[PDB]
Enzyme design. Structure first.
Site, short mmCIF file in Angstrom:
data_model
loop_
_atom_site.label_atom_id
_atom_site.label_comp_id
_atom_site.label_asym_id
_atom_site.label_seq_id
_atom_site.Cartn_x
_atom_site.Cartn_y
_atom_site.Cartn_z
N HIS A 68 6.11 0.28 -0.51
CA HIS A 68 4.95 1.54 -0.99
C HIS A 68 4.40 2.10 0.49
O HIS A 68 3.31 2.25 0.56
CB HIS A 68 4.12 0.85 -1.96
N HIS A 72 8.90 5.97 0.90
CA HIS A 72 8.90 5.93 -0.41
C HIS A 72 8.53 7.21 -0.84
O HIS A 72 9.15 7.99 -1.72
CB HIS A 72 8.23 4.61 -0.94
N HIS A 106 1.79 9.97 -4.58
CA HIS A 106 1.68 9.38 -5.70
C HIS A 106 1.22 7.91 -5.62
O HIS A 106 1.09 7.42 -6.41
CB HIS A 106 2.84 9.55 -6.52
N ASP A 107 1.53 7.53 -4.32
CA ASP A 107 0.98 6.12 -3.91
C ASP A 107 0.21 6.15 -2.67
O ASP A 107 0.39 4.96 -1.94
CB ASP A 107 2.55 5.29 -3.74
N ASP A 217 10.21 8.27 -9.17
CA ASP A 217 9.54 6.76 -8.80
C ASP A 217 10.60 5.52 -8.63
O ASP A 217 10.41 5.11 -7.69
CB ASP A 217 8.54 6.47 -9.36
N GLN A 269 17.26 -8.06 -11.83
CA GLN A 269 18.05 -6.76 -11.63
C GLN A 269 18.37 -6.37 -13.00
O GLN A 269 18.07 -5.11 -13.34
CB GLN A 269 18.64 -6.52 -10.47
#
Ligand SMILES: Cc1cnc(CSc2nc3cc4c(cc3[nH]2)CCO4)c(C)c1Cl
Ligand SMILES: [Mg+2]
Ligand SMILES: [Zn+2]
Length: 313
Positions: A68, A72, A106-107, A217, A269
């Site tokens: 993050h 990213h 956004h992060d 995202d 996953q």
């Protein structure tokens, strides 16, 4: 005014593709973003001096966490750039401005810990914001940076346009709370199938932008296999540290965050692709047909994870 950003030929070409990787040269990431803003929005959308100072302040407010991080932020902005460029006429001038900035921001100030960990730790942010804890923090940090002297990239919007774009950015950032994605995509799935989906209905646009934000995202799952696989290492480096911090609070973490269950990652996953990623890009492809390359890349990566389980890699 007449100052373009230009990229080397390979980047000039590949940056238009959904599966573009922004590379390991951190010092090129700001120029890559500005390039994308200019082609997506216009060379006039933002005062270059103000944009560059906004970008460098956003970069400084991302931390040195495995996933993050600033890379990213730019990666998520590029996925949004590719969506907007392949859907030229579907989005307003304000929306193109707002969404690239929303993605970059956004992060902001992420610590590498989930909303769950903040709540169980009893972090002050969990008292300030009971749901979408980190995402309300990310929007709060975005507003703070916009209010620094010389950083208001929206200064040349009218009062109502300024309120609209900040509202686009807020919804866009809140929508990156994956807990909200499931309900959002279910609603969009119903609206598309019963034919009630209407892109002139603001509440409907909000939902579509929300799904675009989830899609951007998660875009690590839409890269070529070697990028997807190496990014998974960074994702699990964060999750396993959070798992460690759960065990320090005397809480067994979920298997996703327990480094003792590395063996089960390939199966983990699969569930993620099947429960989250494929559904996300399928509904997005239905609403915005030119985003199909994201669903195709995701299906390819699901196939690679199935091959890992069968011991073929
Ligand atoms: C992009 C992306 C890629 N991968 C992931 C991981 S999804 C996921 N990985 C897992 C590993 C596991 C278990 C569940 C899991 N769910 C139980 C046993 O071990 C996320 C959360 C995101 Cl966001
Ligand atoms: Mg987030
Ligand atoms: Zn993110």
């Amino acid at each position: 005014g007449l100052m373009q950003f230009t990229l080397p030929v390979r980047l000039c070409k590949e940056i238009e593709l959904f599966h573009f990787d922004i590379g390991p040269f951190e010092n090129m990431w700001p120029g890559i973003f500005v390039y994308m803003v200019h082609r997506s929005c216009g060379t006039s959308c933002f005062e270059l001096e103000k944009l560059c100072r906004f970008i460098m302040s956003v970069k400084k407010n991302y931390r040195r966490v495995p996933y993050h991080n600033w890379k990213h932020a730019v990666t998520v902005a590029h996925c949004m750039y590719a969506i907007l460029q392949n859907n030229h006429t579907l989005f307003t001038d304000l929306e193109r401005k707002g969404l690239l900035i929303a993605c970059l921001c956004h992060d902001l100030d992420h610590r590498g810990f989930s909303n769950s960990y903040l709540q169980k730790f009893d972090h002050p942010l969990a008292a300030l914001y009971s749901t979408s804890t980190m995402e309300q923090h990310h929007f709060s940090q975005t507003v703070s940076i916009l209010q620094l002297e010389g950083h208001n990239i929206f200064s040349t919007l009218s009062s109502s346009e300024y309120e609209q774009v900040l509202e686009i950015i807020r919804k866009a950032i809140i929508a990156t709370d994956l807990a909200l994605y499931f309900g959002n995509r279910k609603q969009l799935e119903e609206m598309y199938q019963t034919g009630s989906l209407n892109l002139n209905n603001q509440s409907h646009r909000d939902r579509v932008i929300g799904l675009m934000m989830t899609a951007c995202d998660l875009c690590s799952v839409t890269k070529l296999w070697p990028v997807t696989k190496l990014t998974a290492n960074d994702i699990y480096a964060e999750f396993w540290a959070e798992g460690d911090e759960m065990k320090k609070l005397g809480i067994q973490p979920i298997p996703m965050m327990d480094r003792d269950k590395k063996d089960e990652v390939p199966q983990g996953q699969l569930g993620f692709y099947n429960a989250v990623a494929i559904p996300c890009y399928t509904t997005l492809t239905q609403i915005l047909p030119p985003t199909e390359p994201l669903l195709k890349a995701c299906r390819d990566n699901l196939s690679q994870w199935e091959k890992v389980i069968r011991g073929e890699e």
